[PDB]
Design an enzyme around this catalytic site. Structure first.
Site, short mmCIF file in Angstrom:
data_model
loop_
_atom_site.label_atom_id
_atom_site.label_comp_id
_atom_site.label_asym_id
_atom_site.label_seq_id
_atom_site.Cartn_x
_atom_site.Cartn_y
_atom_site.Cartn_z
N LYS A 65 0.53 -1.03 0.30
CA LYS A 65 0.00 -0.41 -0.20
C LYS A 65 1.26 1.29 0.36
CE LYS A 65 -0.31 -0.40 5.32
NZ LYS A 65 -1.33 -0.58 5.87
N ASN A 114 3.83 1.94 2.87
CA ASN A 114 4.39 1.43 3.32
C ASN A 114 5.24 1.37 2.17
OD1 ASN A 114 3.23 -0.92 1.19
ND2 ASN A 114 3.02 -2.24 3.53
N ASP A 137 7.90 -2.66 5.81
CA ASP A 137 6.42 -2.99 6.59
C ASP A 137 5.87 -5.38 6.35
OD1 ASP A 137 4.78 -3.72 8.25
OD2 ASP A 137 3.16 -2.51 6.61
N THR A 196 -4.49 -4.42 4.94
CA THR A 196 -5.45 -2.59 4.48
C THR A 196 -7.02 -3.15 3.55
OG1 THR A 196 -3.49 -2.03 5.41
CG2 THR A 196 -5.56 -0.70 4.73
N1 3Q3 Z 1 9.50 -2.55 8.17
C1 3Q3 Z 1 8.36 -0.88 8.78
N2 3Q3 Z 1 9.35 0.11 8.80
C2 3Q3 Z 1 8.73 0.59 8.89
C3 3Q3 Z 1 9.18 2.35 8.27
C4 3Q3 Z 1 8.22 3.63 8.67
C5 3Q3 Z 1 9.07 5.33 8.35
C6 3Q3 Z 1 10.80 4.75 7.65
C7 3Q3 Z 1 11.15 5.81 7.08
N3 3Q3 Z 1 11.12 7.47 7.43
N4 3Q3 Z 1 12.39 4.73 6.43
N5 3Q3 Z 1 12.29 4.24 6.95
C8 3Q3 Z 1 10.97 3.50 8.55
C9 3Q3 Z 1 10.58 2.61 8.14
C10 3Q3 Z 1 7.53 0.67 9.25
C11 3Q3 Z 1 6.56 -0.24 9.47
N6 3Q3 Z 1 5.70 -0.02 10.32
C12 3Q3 Z 1 4.75 0.69 11.19
C13 3Q3 Z 1 3.17 0.83 10.67
O1 3Q3 Z 1 3.04 -0.35 10.89
C14 3Q3 Z 1 4.03 -1.61 10.41
C15 3Q3 Z 1 2.91 -2.50 11.08
O2 3Q3 Z 1 2.67 -2.84 12.43
N7 3Q3 Z 1 2.55 -3.77 10.16
C16 3Q3 Z 1 2.43 -5.11 10.76
C17 3Q3 Z 1 1.25 -4.84 11.87
C18 3Q3 Z 1 1.13 -6.21 12.39
C19 3Q3 Z 1 1.27 -7.94 11.53
C20 3Q3 Z 1 2.87 -7.28 10.98
C21 3Q3 Z 1 3.23 -6.13 10.24
C22 3Q3 Z 1 5.19 -1.66 10.78
N8 3Q3 Z 1 7.72 -1.39 9.17
#
Ligand code: 3Q3
Length: 275
Positions: free
Chosen positions: A135, A138, A151, A162
């Site tokens: 989406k 991410n 993500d 989503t």
């Molecule tokens: N890997 C990862 N990276 C970021 C991120 C953000 C900003 C960044 C930037 N500016 N540089 N790099 C960045 C990296 C964010 C993120 N998520 C946040 C939103 O929620 C997701 C969640 O909970 N997924 C889920 C939930 C439940 C189960 C499985 C998966 C996890 N995951």
């Protein structure tokens, strides 16, 4: 390999993102002055809420990946209470932000960013990995304005995401395949062009109703070749989506007329069109 890193090795700054059971924080490594997006998780909370498999899945997937269009996992460490994942810092944030900012993409920008997403999925799927929750939120943008997908806790490694981007097969079978990501791609292309996701309604239930009915439509101002492409992706039968194995993969997808002027070999080396 370098010694294990630790919290005291960094100066932490602003929050970059909030997850269901994690928080991503901008951090500068003191010794190198490098900036990382550090995802912080509370071990107690992850255990209590039975989230260990998602955390492990994200670590294992984001390690197997070595391609410019994906956020990279550089290191991990922990203290008494927390896990820390050191991720690529994508300075320009979420693709969703740019869609909201500029309203809707012109054809040159839609084509370039659609192409990078297709190229990223080709890499991912070639490793037998499915994202399962792709989406605009991410799909991040680097300082250079190239995408970086993140993500991966919901990813699947081949032997509900989503609402707006959920594929019909999730709603009717609880099953997902490479083609589920392609459905997501169709919704994202539609949104880049129309400025809105194709399946919108008052609530989640109503959105799901539209999906299983393929109830959506194109605005008049929709680039016709983009429309044709979207129509080849938003198909109820997952085995008939352009790009999927039963349709002979990425060749025919990349050969679609919408991508006529695309040079596929080195997108990451090209200068993105200004938004
Ligand atoms: N890997 C990862 N990276 C970021 C991120 C953000 C900003 C960044 C930037 N500016 N540089 N790099 C960045 C990296 C964010 C993120 N998520 C946040 C939103 O929620 C997701 C969640 O909970 N997924 C889920 C939930 C439940 C189960 C499985 C998966 C996890 N995951």
């Amino acid at each position: 390999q370098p010694r294990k890193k630790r919290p005291e090795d960094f100066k932490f700054g602003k929050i970059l993102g909030e997850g269901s059971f994690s928080t991503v924080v901008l951090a500068r490594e003191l010794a190198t002055s490098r900036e990382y997006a550090i995802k912080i998780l509370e071990k107690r909370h992850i255990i209590k809420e039975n989230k260990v498999p998602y955390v492990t899945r994200e670590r294992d997937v984001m390690s197997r990946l070595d391609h410019p269009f994906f956020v990279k996992l550089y290191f991990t460490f922990q203290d008494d209470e927390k896990l820390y994942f050191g991720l690529s810092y994508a300075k320009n944030g979420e693709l969703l932000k740019y869609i909201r900012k500029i309203g809707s993409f012109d054809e040159t920008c839609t084509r370039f960013y659609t192409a990078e997403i297709v190229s990223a999925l080709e890499y991912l799927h070639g490793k037998g990995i499915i994202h399962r929750d792709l989406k605009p939120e991410n799909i991040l943008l680097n300082e250079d304005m190239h995408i970086q997908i993140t993500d991966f806790g919901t990813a699947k490694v081949l032997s509900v995401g989503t609402a707006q981007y959920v594929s019909p097969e999730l709603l009717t079978e609880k099953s997902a395949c490479k083609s589920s990501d392609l459905w997501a791609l169709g919704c994202i292309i539609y949104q880049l062009v129309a400025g809105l996701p194709p399946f919108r309604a008052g609530n989640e239930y109503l959105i799901f109703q539209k999906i299983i009915k393929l109830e959506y439509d194109f605005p008049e101002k929709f680039f016709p070749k983009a429309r044709d492409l979207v129509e080849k992706l938003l198909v109820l039968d997952a085995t008939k989506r352009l790009g999927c194995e039963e349709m002979e993969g990425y060749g025919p997808l990349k050969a679609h007329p919408f991508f006529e002027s695309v040079t596929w070999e080195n997108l990451h080396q090209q200068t993105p069109p200004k938004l």
